[PDB]
Write a protein that binds this DNA or RNA. Structure first.
Ligand SMILES: Nc1ccn([C@H]2C[C@H](O)[C@@H](COP(=O)(O)OP(=O)(O)OP(=O)(O)O)O2)c(=O)n1
Ligand SMILES: OC[C@H]1O[C@@](CO)(O[C@H]2O[C@H](CO)[C@@H](O)[C@H](O)[C@H]2O)[C@@H](O)[C@@H]1O
Length: 580
DNA sequence: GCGATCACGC
DNA sequence: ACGTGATCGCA
């Protein structure tokens, strides 16, 4: 049964009521400088569809959009806000975002359209976007009557569902998490994405050219050492060269054949000179394909900026993710890849990049949640936590901790945060399951509060059905009750890890909100460009560095109050590389 | 188009 | 743990 609405030819006052469900539809997945294909408004006066060329040229409509006192309920308001920013139009007054609400209620539903959210509350009078638009090469905006009905049904769904979603959030003690954390964050992310990050494309191109030359040289050395040309990027053609023509040992298998992962190759290197060259080839090829070529493909040729999209409603722990480009995995560990960061530069003359990162926030969060006396004391002393962990688990003085001991203790600390298992620690350290289990036992002997936490959190997940973070983010773990050991064990590790990873996410999100407020209060021109889980990257005039050196770490350190201090390191420089 | 594999970040 | 995405190769 069709849904009634006015297919409007002009904007009227009744469309500009002080509460409405608003749809500002951007069908392109990447909404940067993208078309708005249609607008729907549902409010106390009825249901309306507006052509965007009409609405967005209308001064009254534009003023309504930008009026903070005119409240709008939406789904994925960031998409609309950014698309409107590209058109020089400010969207304000978004009081409810159904995407974020659905995400907080259950991130596992993978809600990514209104229909999916609606189905959570048995509301089915709206089509999935994929049904309307199609996907891939077949994707298209449909004719107006079909488009208009869809946008109106989405607006109608939002109008109906706001209350039951808010009611459930309130029951879960998550309504503040939506209204005071995620919704304000969405506006901040919209700003960051719209600002973009300036790229030194000539530098990337120069690196591209040098990598191409190095790739050619290593490629040829590989064919030489193999006495044969083949496709090095096929883990199957490669597996044949290595494990058949050259007869190398099969140390590890995949599901469909031989492993050629770097950890395996590193083990095979002593047998044949080809292996180190395959590794080198892989390193260079990663830089060339993913970073150089990948960045260059998405840089805007006019402004030479990249404009990531931070997916705020994807990860199961409350982290953001970043796409097109992913600016959360730019290399740093290896110097060769780290130089990619030299191409990320400030957007204005005489500005600098300022980067601030939490030091060991996940382990500090663990100390807090677990109330582990030893771990808390370690952070209260600002100890090197890996050296301290080695001291405790290997029962030596600080002076007796060797580099290998620190390395193994560090791995244990990661294992503990990730949700410890002897098999997984064993794989990481290239040791036996029994040896890994002894390490873990020693760790829990030294950190008995952490042990009690890991036990208790798994029991709580079983009892309640979910675990929660500091600011009341939730993750359901139905597999915690599985009688399949492997399935259950993965859920147990999620129980252990999610409050840690997710509370750290909560903290940095709050820090972003607090920081933006302080930046505005101080009228600094500095602004956020990126978040990389435990770090914030800003740019600012060079004249603001001294103020940022004090302000940014303070705001980040004070975002929450834990049983241990939070510590933030910071650096600045003329490129992201130099902000070290 | 999509799954397997691999490698980059935290 | 939690992510994105490149290439291959088989649809
Ligand atoms: N109705 C509520 C109550 C709490 N919280 C979240 C956000 C708060 O910052 C955090 C802490 O709650 P309390 O301060 O009440 O403890 O939990 C929430 O989202 N909604
Ligand atoms: O706008 C981001 C928001 O949209 C969703 C779908 O609702 O993801 C879409 O947009 C992403 C960014 O372009 C794409 O990566 C994704 O493939 C696309 O579905 C949400 O997941 C996201 O929060």
């Amino acid at each position: 049964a069709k849904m009634a609405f006015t297919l409007a030819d002009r904007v009227t006052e009744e469309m500009l009521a002080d509460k409405a469900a608003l749809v500002v539809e951007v069908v392109e997945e990447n909404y940067h400088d993208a078309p708005i294909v249609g607008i729907a408004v549902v409010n106390e006066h009825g249901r309306f569809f507006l052509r965007p060329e009409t609405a967005l040229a209308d001064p009254q409509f534009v003023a309504w959009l930008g009026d903070e006192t005119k409240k709008k309920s939406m789904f994925d308001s960031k998409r609309a806000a950014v698309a409107l920013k590209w058109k020089g139009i400010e969207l304000c007054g978004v009081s409810f975002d159904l995407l974020l609400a659905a995400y907080l209620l259950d991130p596992a539903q993978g809600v990514d359209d209104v229909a999916a959210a609606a189905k959570m509350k048995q509301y089915e009078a709206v089509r999935p976007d994929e049904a309307v638009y199609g996907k891939g090469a077949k994707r298209a905006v449909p004719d107006e009557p079909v488009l208009a009905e869809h946008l109106v049904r989405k607006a109608a769904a939002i109008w109906e569902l706001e209350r039951p979603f808010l009611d459930e959030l309130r029951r879960n003690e998550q309504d503040r998490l939506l209204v005071e954390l995620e919704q304000p964050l969405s506006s901040i992310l919209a700003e960051m994405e719209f600002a973009g990050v300036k790229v030194d494309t000539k530098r990337l191109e120069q690196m591209g050219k040098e990598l191409a030359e190095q790739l050619g040289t290593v490629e040829q050395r590989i064919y030489e050492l193999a006495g044969q040309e083949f496709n090095i990027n096929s883990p199957k053609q490669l597996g044949v060269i290595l494990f058949e023509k050259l007869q190398l040992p099969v140390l590890k298998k995949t599901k469909t054949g031989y492993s050629t992962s770097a950890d395996v190759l590193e083990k095979l290197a002593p047998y044949h000179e080809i292996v180190e060259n395959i590794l080198h080839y892989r390193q260079l090829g990663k830089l060339q394909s993913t970073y150089i070529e990948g960045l260059l493909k998405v840089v805007r040729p006019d402004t030479k900026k990249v404009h990531t999209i931070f997916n705020q409603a994807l990860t199961q722990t409350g982290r953001l993710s970043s796409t097109e480009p992913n600016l959360q995995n730019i290399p740093i560990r290896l110097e060769e890849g780290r130089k990619i960061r030299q191409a990320f530069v400030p957007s204005e003359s005489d500005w600098l990049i300022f980067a601030a990162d939490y030091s060991q926030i996940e382990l500090r969060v663990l100390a807090h949640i677990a109330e582990d006396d030893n771990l808390m004391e370690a952070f209260r002393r600002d100890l090197d936590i890996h050296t301290k962990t080695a001291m405790d688990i290997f029962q030596v003085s600080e002076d007796e901790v060797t580099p290998n001991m620190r390395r193994q203790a560090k791995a244990v600390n990661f294992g503990i945060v990730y949700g410890i298992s002897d098999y997984g620690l064993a794989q990481n350290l290239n040791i036996s399951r029994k040896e890994a289990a002894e390490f873990i036992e020693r760790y829990f002997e030294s950190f008995p509060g952490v042990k009690r936490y890991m036990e208790n959190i798994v029991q709580e997940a079983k009892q309640k059905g979910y675990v929660t973070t500091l600011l009341h983010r939730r993750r359901y773990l139905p597999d915690i009750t599985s009688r399949n050991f492997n399935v259950r064990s993965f859920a147990e590790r999620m129980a252990m890890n999610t409050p840690i990873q997710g509370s750290a996410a909560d903290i940095i999100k709050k820090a972003m909100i607090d920081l933006n407020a302080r930046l505005k209060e101080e009228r600094l021109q500095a602004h956020l460009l990126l978040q990389v889980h435990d770090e914030l990257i800003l740019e600012a005039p060079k004249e603001e560095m001294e103020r940022l050196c004090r302000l940014v770490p303070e705001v980040m350190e004070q975002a929450v109050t834990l049983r241990v201090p939070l510590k933030v390191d910071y650096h600045y420089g003329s490129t992201w590389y130099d902000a070290k």
